A paper describes a structure:
In Gram-positive bacteria, nitrogen homeostasis is controlled by an operon encoding glutamine synthetase (GS), a dodecameric machine that assimilates ammonium into glutamine, and the GlnR repressor. GlnR detects nitrogen excess indirectly by binding glutamine-feedback-inhibited-GS (FBI-GS), which activates its transcription-repression function.
In these structures, the Met-Sox-P methyl group occupies the ammonium substrate binding site, thus mimicking the GS transition state and preventing further reaction. Structures of the Pp, Lm, and Sa GS-Met-Sox-P-ADP complexes were obtained to 1.98, 3.50, and 2.95 Å resolution, respectively. Hence, the contacts in the Pp structure will be described here due to its higher resolution. The side chains of Tyr199 and Arg329 make stacking interactions with the adenine base and Ser247 makes a hydrogen bond to the adenine N1 atom. Contacts to the Met-Sox-P phosphate are provided by Mg2+ ions and the side chains of GS residues Arg314, Arg329, Arg333, Arg334, and His243. The Arg296 side chain interacts with the Met-Sox carboxyl moiety and the Met-Sox-P amide nitrogen interacts with the Glu132 side chain as well as the carbonyl of Gly239. Catalytic E flap residue Glu302 contacts Asp52´ and is close to the Met-Sox-P methyl group. The Glu302–Asp52´ interaction would shield the Met-Sox-P from attack by bulk solvent as well as facilitate proton abstraction of the ammonium to form ammonia.
Numbering used by the authors:
A (entry chain B), C (entry chain B): 2 to 81, 85 to 442
B (entry chain A): 2 to 81, 84 to 442
């Protein structure tokens, strides 16, 4: 790991002139202040301050002073006067860590895993995105960047150059990129990168979204991670591939098993399934998230698992060994990555600690099953809208405890205001259906 | 009470050349075929047919032949060239039995349950509010309301005076007893009140009222709508259903010894309305948009409660006594099928009487500003928050399900489940505005 | 006076098909419901009801039922199926008169005058108005109907036909019209009518405004009684000419006096002056009212009186006998006529009852006096804005008592919301002055 002295040294060597101190609000939005390198020693002394009452989910105006403590291992130089980055943890002025810090929330849950002997939670996220064209002014239009489809080539796929420049920038920043391709829906794109320990994976999701939007704009496009920008075509998921490790060993892997899944893996999966409905408000946190969780678009809407199957909530991909993993498919890229990893880890650990029995897999296209069949086989549904998910979240002591009292209370208040504003709108669909009929 | 010979005579007297045979589909939409007067004897002979598979909620393509039996007492000439009259018809199957899914037959069935308990009439006074929108050169509505006036305003703040006045003149030529007309609370919103009538006639008059309003509004270059909530942030349109039971000429809801003038029968009736309020919401508030009106702060109900002279609760008792003593059920909106709405409210009320239900305490506050904590304290239930929740309550209610009958219930549920599922998968512009640049 | 039986009879004789039951909200806005003549007997039985929670200043949603009791002497037929009118008083369902009814408030103050022996308060109001052109859609533009001036003729004055049709309609409705002319500002107009007892004068102001706006629209124009629609030109006043009578005798008249003013007249004037600042919130009730009360436009802004002088708050016109009167010039036509007459009568009566000493007149152009001179002669200012006027209103027990507790509390709450909304706006003037300067 880097020391204080290492950062000073490297900042001079690479001639860094500016440093961004970055952190994440409750809703997952990245935030930063930029300081000249003359201030780097002040920043490393943990003395930078900000207004916590202007950051969503943090504190109130009457006790608004908060501090940034940089995590020196997050040091990296931006490719696009040299600018560098430090991701920071949030502290109160009395020196204690801030309970509502999403990154601290993940670290707290990860300590629970370490005490059970798991040295790391490895996470490979797949944050899909759409690219929209922009007008003369630079705002997004309703027109997608192309009308291509899954694995298409140019000129059907017009995202090749934009995705490739994203990849080159991510690689200069230390990402191990695995693949790049057009996704199923028009104007939809995917760039995959190697799994990493959970905190780093969530840091990389934040950085990934930032690089994607920055490069998209240089190409005259607008990138969005909105879960379902368009009816009738695929939405964008952020599948969270997960495994637990003991130093070097993927403990989810058992070569004697049919699917390569250890008993620990199956208990973990059972925990994800058990608490699926209760974590949905965190993994699928917008009104629009539930427009993606509709049947027929390779997004889940029922609580089930199956191997090599893209209809259920959990897929077990058809590979084994170090790549043995649980693919939880319901999160979308609007989820706060720190909170989403935290609640899924706590749900998985509860499954392990209580040795929860794994339900039988649903080895079929779950979308074409009737409600009758779903009831016969005891297949629950994911929540149908944000309000229902929120009601399940507050009733869950396991998921509530993951979040802690502060984030839970702020998250619920924000989302109840969001839902009440949505629910009272009169949408154009209603005018089209009813204005001339009634 | 008109005979066939009366209708023949009157059509000649008035020089009627065409007759509309009118009826109502399951969702409340009026339907008709127009016949020349040369065909009137065939129509009075109950021989007119139609395709029941093309009328929402009736029958399937493989069993699609259906008959119209005119109700002779619904005869009226339209006042607005070659004279046109109408008859409202009941729906019959080719074997001669009345169609189980006919909304007008459904209300008549429930009314017979009232008659056997001694009540000779259910008197109903509906207040169907509506908006007037301007139209473009092609005649379709724009987003602009006809005016920006408000409650009881005068011209030129209220620009609907002439349109409302001509509606009133046409309705009175058609035998309506008009009581009042005024601008309502929201911009471009209007109200025309007419005297209560027995339930079937009241529902027939609701169907006729909506037709005349839309026809005259179009003559004035406007588009009338009974959509419950066309615009966020201003009042929606309700159809308050004022209700009383009579024994020949006596209003059995009236008791002068009572502080509000309500008899014990009225109080039991109200208790049945409140008991079944959530279960009949899908009928009285049958669209997705209905539930954007059932939000607090706009004189539409949100919570299941009653109060005197209070416009915040579900039931208001107006500060009138005597023949005008009544129960104002405020939650229906003018998208409700009037025959089905009256049928389920009547059934709920009668169930409250047969079971001698205890009437909850009144909520004598602005219920909108009560905290959720206070509302649980008093045990005030909520109306369903959306159409899907309303449908779930409907199919679980034996009392409301049996008001509708097996046929209408099954078709209503199938239609509305499809409607809900279509709405719930849409991505609305609000979502793009909130999320496309934030995420 | 008319009886119930008289109204039924006349309604049949003149073939009236519809009746408007009219009344006035707290802010002076006329309101009505239209009933078919079949309902006339119900209306005369005092059984018509309305939602008092939708009428500004009346009652709350939880006790919203209110009743209309028509005043049979207000019967009149509209000129423009015959429609008639009845002005109504407001009652609660328990049968008591509604304390917040502006017309009942005036009648209550008038009872105070009758007990002192004055049989009527005669009031001649001069409600000036502007006419604006309208667009293709019918909304007002910024363009006035003409660019004429005081007493101008066509084609400089383009309001002649519109004013003349207003006059003809008012005369068919029983008005005694006295004069019609273009006023000082472009597009500004005046129609005068004979004084009447106070309640009738206020009824006639309501009817006058309605006829003016109706006929203006038939001519493709928009009439407004806004006090000051345009900077730098005259605003619109509603001068309230006032006198007290004993049966037939103008008690303000004394032929032995220099100005023809009785001692009663001078005490009344002293009361108006004493409470000028305290009644301003009622006589000048909008934010815009105080844009008219600026110097140089024949509107008052200082508390003073003078004969044949159009600079002060009170003018004594140069005529005597039955036309001896006190012209209170500060009210504008946005004032509720019932409340405005009520507070000025109560102020005048307080002057009589306390035999208040009349200050010396200010026989000069008061606009060109320096602040120093104004202080030397003890000339107070009218309030500078609505907020200051409201603060003076609540501190006045004489004017507060005129209004009664209900109207006072609703009026203050409405106007404090109005003022707080105005005071936080950022106006274009501020952008023009400061956006490029700072
Ligand atoms: N043991 C593991 N634990 C967690 N993630 C893993 C593991 N092995 C591989 N992954 C990651 O899972 C993700 C798979 O993404 P992708 O190749 O898009 O899969 P698919 O499209 O089949 O879902 C990659 O980020 C990959 O690095
Ligand atoms: N006994 C009664 N039963 C049913 N309806 C009645 C009865 N008495 C009056 N009504 C009706 O109730 C309705 C009241 O409507 P409206 O006058 O708009 O009342 P509000 O606006 O006060 O709710 C009218 O249709 C009236 O005829
Ligand atoms: N004794 C009186 N009391 C009240 N008003 C009066 C009396 N005599 C005349 N008036 C009225 O005063 C008003 C004078 O208006 P106007 O002729 O426009 O006067 P000016 O333009 O000079 O102010 C008229 O309504 C007139 O009828
Ligand atoms: C072909 S897809 O299966 C698309 C998934 C969809 N966009 C969703 O999760 O909403 N995803 P993957 O990258 O896992 O193969
Ligand atoms: C003033 S209002 O109270 C408006 C009610 C509202 N439009 C609704 O029921 O949605 N109705 P009413 O005619 O009963 O007085
Ligand atoms: C010439 S004017 O003096 C105009 C008065 C001005 N409009 C005002 O009172 O604001 N009025 P009047 O009709 O009294 O002669
Ligand atoms: Mg993938
Ligand atoms: Mg994918
Ligand atoms: Mg995947
Ligand atoms: Mg009404
Ligand atoms: Mg109404
Ligand atoms: Mg009503
Ligand atoms: Mg004048
Ligand atoms: Mg003048
Ligand atoms: Mg004057």
């Amino acid at each position: 790991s880097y020391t204080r002295e290492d950062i000073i040294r490297i900042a001079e060597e690479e001639n860094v002139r500016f440093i961004r101190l970055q952190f994440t609000d409750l809703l997952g939005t990245i935030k930063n202040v930029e300081i000249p390198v003359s201030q780097l020693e002040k920043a490393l002394d943990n003395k930078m301050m900000f207004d916590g009452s202007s950051i969503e989910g943090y504190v109130r105006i009457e006790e608004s002073d908060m501090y940034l403590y940089p995590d020196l291992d997050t040091w990296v130089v931006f490719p696009w006067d040299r600018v560098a980055r430090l991701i920071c943890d949030i502290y109160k002025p009395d020196g204690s860590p801030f309970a509502g810090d999403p990154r601290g929330i993940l670290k707290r849950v990860l300590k629970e895993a370490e005490e059970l002997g798991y040295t790391s939670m490895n996470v490979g996220p797949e944050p899909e995105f759409f690219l929209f064209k922009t007008d003369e002014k630079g705002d997004p239009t309703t027109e997608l960047n192309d009308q291509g489809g899954y694995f298409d080539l140019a000129p059907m796929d017009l995202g090749e150059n934009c995705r490739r420049e994203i990849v080159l920038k991510l690689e200069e920043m230390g990402f191990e990129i695995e693949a790049s391709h057009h996704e199923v829906a028009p104007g939809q794109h995917e760039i995959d990168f190697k799994y990493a320990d959970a905190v780093k994976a969530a840091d990389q999701i934040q950085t990934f979204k930032l690089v994607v939007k920055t490069i998209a704009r240089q190409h005259g496009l607008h990138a969005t991670f909105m879960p379902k920008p368009l009816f009738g075509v695929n939405g964008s998921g952020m599948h969270c591939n997960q495994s637990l490790f003991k130093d070097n060993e993927n403990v989810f892997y058992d070569e004697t098993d049919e699917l390569g899944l250890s008993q620990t893996a199956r208990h973990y999966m059972a925990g994800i399934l058990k608490h699926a409905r209760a974590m949905a408000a965190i993994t699928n946190p917008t009104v629009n998230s539930y427009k993606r969780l509709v049947p027929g678009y390779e997004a889940p809407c029922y609580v089930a698992w199956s191997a090599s199957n893209r209809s259920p909530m959990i897929r077990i991909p058809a590979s084994r060994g170090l790549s043995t993993r649980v693919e939880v498919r319901n999160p979308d890229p609007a989820a706060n990555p720190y909170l989403a990893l935290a609640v899924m880890l706590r749900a998985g650990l509860d499954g392990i600690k209580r040795q929860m029995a794994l339900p039988a897999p649903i080895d079929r296209n779950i979308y074409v099953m009737s409600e009758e069949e779903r009831i016969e086989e005891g297949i629950p549904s994911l929540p149908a809208d944000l309000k229902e998910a929120l009601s399940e979240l507050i009733r869950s002591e396991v998921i509530s405890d993951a979040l802690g009292d502060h984030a839970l209370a702020y998250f619920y208040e924000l989302k109840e205001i969001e839902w009440d504003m949505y629910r009272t709108q009169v949408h154009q669909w209603e005018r089209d259906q009813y204005l001339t009929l009634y």
